[PDB]
Each structure stands twice: as C-alpha cells, then as structure tokens.
Amino acid sequence: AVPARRTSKAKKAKRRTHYKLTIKGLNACSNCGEMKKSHHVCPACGHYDGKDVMSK
C-alpha cells in the first residue's frame, strides 16, 4: 500500500535499538599476547597451537 503518515523522530529511534554491530570472542595469544579471534589462525603471529602453520 502507501504509508499513511510521517513517522516521528521517536519511532525512528525506537526501531533501531536492534540495529547494532557487536563483536564476538577475542582471546589473547600465547606467542604475542595480542587480541585475536578464538579458534582462528593468529595472522600477525602466524601461529596456532604454537606451530608455524602459515609458513613453508
């Protein structure tokens, strides 16, 4: 159909309380202590389970 009215400034914001970006698990490494993702290959470290994996 066609919207009947202008929605006010209040119901702009009362929708958008579920329009967020959130960040999931951030572990710290072993070889550098740097904040990186759980279960993921540590990119700057190049290690995972203490192994030169991304090498080659």
């Binding site: 279960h39 993921h40 290959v41 990119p43 995972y48 994996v53 991304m54």
Partner: protein
Amino acid sequence: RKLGRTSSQRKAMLRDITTDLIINERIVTTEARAKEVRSTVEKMITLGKRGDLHARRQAATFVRNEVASVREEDESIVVESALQKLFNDLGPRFAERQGGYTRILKTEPRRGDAAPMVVIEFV
C-alpha cells in the same frame, strides 16, 4: 549433503577442487567447499591404498585427465599426470594411516564478500 549450485555443477566444482590438493596440497577456499572436499578427497585416497584395476577404473570419475605435475627427470622430460601421483606417492604416504587425512584451518573473512576463508592441508 550441502546444495551449492545446480546438480551437475557440483560435480564440476568438486572435480575441480579435488583434482587440486593432489597437485599442491594447500588450497585456500571458503568454509563449506572445504567440507565437501574433505569427504570426497578422503574417499579418493582409499582407492590409492588398493592399487587394483578397480582402483584405476574407479578413479576415472574424480580425476581430470590431462593434468600434469612434474618434479622429475633422469635424462628426459617425464611427467606425472596427477593420478599416477595417487597410485605412486599418496598411497604409500598414508599406507599406515587410518581415516582422517586432512586439516581445515580458519583464517579470515574475504575482503570482497565477507566470506570466511579456509586452508586445507594433509598431514
């Protein structure tokens, strides 16, 4: 199963990716393609343990014919053809290994599409 595309296109996809790793042993792709390549590669190394004619004449499905891989000469130009590599190298590598010939590692999302990406290796 995991539907990805139409019917015959999945056969094309998995013959593409699983005739790779026979040649290179590393592959960088997405997540779900790696799981289908898990299953199909490990089903096509157990034929590399047998060495019969049925080992060859069931490898006529998931092997691209004219595909080379050379680290080889004596005084010649002599060419392994990526199925010979199964029946001469990868068989005797995992002659004593049971199932589970692969690794899947979780690196990064792709820049273009935020598709998370994945490394496959063997040992």
